[PDB]
């Protein structure tokens, strides 16, 4: 199938409680494979996938050094952004970034990503061309100027097209038994009386990987989008995910309702009904 690698970085200032915490977490699809945390008591702890451990101390030493430099850079960037927004030194602020690459089944680049948010708001992003920037406001235009002057996009392009793709391919090979395995949802429908007059039908999907899934209810073959309660897909803790979708149905009309499930691990999409 297709795959992605993405790092999710968070720098958080905490005036009066030390230097800003910096955490960088790496994922292949929905699998976390590395974590670096400036608050780590012992580097012996920062968790990593078994297939990362096999890369040895050279890989770990190089990545640890990159993380340490990234910590310094984002801390300074936090300082600069506080200034760009005329903010007091007293408040806590957050700088986040996401970067990485999407590849197809053939392992070829689909597109790259490198973008940033400040206090939860989009700030600057590398465009799909991997050459130009989109700045959200006059503050981010300053960052854009600095990054154009230093040719940062060219470095990021080289990473996204080269390093990112090559390492994603390597991780997929080393972790193939998990990373290239899609686990289909285990599905069933439950029935929950509300009153004499109506009941909830809940369609369940359990144990699936990756997280992407489509779960819908139809009534007489018509999508019930507005009438469906659909919970966010949620992690089970064993790598897999769960989701449900529910509709309120008049007593006696249950068989007019069908649940539809689509997921990468299914050879065929499912159609389910309440089975009393």
């Amino acid at each position: 199938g297709s795959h992605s690698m993405r790092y999710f970085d968070t720098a958080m200032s905490r005036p009066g409680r030390g230097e800003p915490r910096f955490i960088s977490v790496g994922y292949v699809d929905d699998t976390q494979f590395v974590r670096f945390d400036s608050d780590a008591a012992s580097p012996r702890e920062e968790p990593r996938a078994p297939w990362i451990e096999q890369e040895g101390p050279e890989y770990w030493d190089r990545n640890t050094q990159i993380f340490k430099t990234n910590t310094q850079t984002d801390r300074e960037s936090l300082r600069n952004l506080r200034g760009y927004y005329n903010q007091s030194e007293a408040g806590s602020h957050t700088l986040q970034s996401m970067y990485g690459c999407d590849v197809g089944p053939d392992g070829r680049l689909l597109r790259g990503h490198n973008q940033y948010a400040y206090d939860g708001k989009d700030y600057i992003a590398l465009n799909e061309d991997l050459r130009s920037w989109t700045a959200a406001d006059t503050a981010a235009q300053i960052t854009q100027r600095k990054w154009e002057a230093a040719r940062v996009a060219e470095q990021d392009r080289a990473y996204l097209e080269g390093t990112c793709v090559e390492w994603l391919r390597r991780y997929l090979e080393n972790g193939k038994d998990t990373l290239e395995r899609a686990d289909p949802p285990k599905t069933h429908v439950t029935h929950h009386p509300i009153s004499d007059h109506e009941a909830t039908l809940r369609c369940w999907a359990l144990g699936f990987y990756p997280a992407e899934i489509t779960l819908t209810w139809q009534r007489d073959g018509e999508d019930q989008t507005q009438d469906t309660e659909l919970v966010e897909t949620r992690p089970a803790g064993d790598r897999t995910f769960q989701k449900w979708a529910a509709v309120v149905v008049p007593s006696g009309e249950e068989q007019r309702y069908t649940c539809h499930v689509q997921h990468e691990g299914l050879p065929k999409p499912l159609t389910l009904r309440w089975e009393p």
Partner: peptide
């Protein structure tokens, strides 16, 4: 593999 952040924003 981490990307190198070098230039302050």
């Amino acid at each position: 593999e981490l990307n190198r952040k070098m230039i302050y924003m």
